[PDB]
Amino acid sequence: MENFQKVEKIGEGTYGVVYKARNKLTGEVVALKKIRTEGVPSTAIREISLLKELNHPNIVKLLDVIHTENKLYLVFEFLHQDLKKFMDASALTGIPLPLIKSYLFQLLQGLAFCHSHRVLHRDLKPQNLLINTEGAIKLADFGLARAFGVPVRTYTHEVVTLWYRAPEILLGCKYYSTAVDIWSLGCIFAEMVTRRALFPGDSEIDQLFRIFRTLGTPDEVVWPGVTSMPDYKPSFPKWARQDFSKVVPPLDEDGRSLLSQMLHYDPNKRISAKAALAHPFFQDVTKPVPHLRL
């Protein structure tokens, strides 16, 4: 290439291929994401460029945005593993509660920062949470979804994961709020605890109905305005709500309480990242060292 020497292909994200690369000059190791298609919005590059200013210990640093050859390259600080792989690796024994709590606490700090700066993630999922050997966890891809509006798919035949999508997005809301990220994080929290995806839908309607089957079909009482949402249908089946005690066993009441607040149907009732940080669940939070095999 130029100043980068490709080390390996880390995968193919929701936008393009990703390579672990080394700056032939500085020797720094980074993750290089090649963005897919022939023009590239000048509006996007401006907004993206703004994200370079988004510095927080729990947010993967966006080192550079390179628009050349009329194609886009994003250079990110590199982390060795993502939470999806770590969760799979910890499946037999489960991630210890102190580490689950540490990660959740750090992720909420990251979200509180992004949200206070009017930046939404919009597509939080285990694969987008990166971890290192020091016990840190960081949010990857903040603000990229907005600088591109609607996601749809990756770029070339790849099944988009809907498991962490907030119900307002599924019901067609056109304006996302910071609440969508809290919902996704609540789903991730539940998954670390039970070692199974909370709402593993395989279609937009299956996703919505899995949510309804567990939290109850929403109505005007718990979610004012829900029946007027774009894709709401009076024909939706009416399921009764289940008990959290059965949803995320054996999580304690502090944890169930916080999760319930992160999973409220009304985006406006859903707890903020800042408020969640003050929840009693974090009274004894610590920063454990994970057993990471690289």
Residue 181, judged by CB atoms within 10 A of its CB (0-12, 13-18, 19+), counts as buried
* Residue 35 assigned as binding residue: no
- Residue closer to ligand X75 (CB basis): 17 or 285: 17
* Residue 78 assigned as binding residue: yes
Residue 238, judged by CB atoms within 10 A of its CB (0-12, 13-18, 19+), counts as exposed
Distance of CA 66 to the CA centre of its chain: 24
Q: Tell me the residue type at 226.
A: V
Closest distance to ligand X75 from the beta carbon of 7 (Å): 9
- Residue closer to ligand X75 (CB basis): 13 or 290: 13
> How many of the other CB atoms lie within 10 Å of CB of 253?
11
- Which residue's CB atom is positioned nearest to ligand X75? 31
- Residue closer to ligand X75 (CB basis): 10 or 292: 10
DSSP string covering 70-103: TEEEEEEE--SEEHHHHHHHTTTT---HHHHHHH
Which member of 64, 88, 123, 243 is catalytic? 123
* Residue 126 assigned as binding residue: yes
Closest distance to ligand X75 from the beta carbon of 32 (Å): 8
* Residue 110 assigned as binding residue: no
In this structure, the chain runs to a length of 294
Q: Is 231 a catalytic residue?
A: no
Contact 167, 208 (CB under 8 A): yes
Closest distance to ligand X75 from the beta carbon of 164 (Å): 16
* Residue 11 assigned as binding residue: yes
Closest distance to ligand X75 from the beta carbon of 8 (Å): 6
* Residue 127 assigned as binding residue: yes
Q: How far is CA 106 from CA 10, 65, 169, 198, 282, in A?
A: 24, 26, 25, 21, 11
User: Residue written as tokens 């016990």?
Assistant: 135
- Residue closer to ligand X75 (CB basis): 44 or 179: 44
Closest distance to ligand X75 from the beta carbon of 12 (Å): 8
- H/E element holding 246? helix 244-247
- Contacting residues toward ligand X75, per CB under 6 A: 10-11, 13, 18, 20, 31, 33, 60, 76, 78-82, 130, 140
Per the annotation, where are the binding residues for Mg(2+)? 128, 141
Residue numbers in the known binding site for ATP are: 10-18, 33, 77-79, 82, 125-128, 141
Catalytic residue positions, numbered: 123
User: Which residues contribute to the annotated binding site?
Assistant: 10-18, 33, 77-79, 82, 125-128, 141
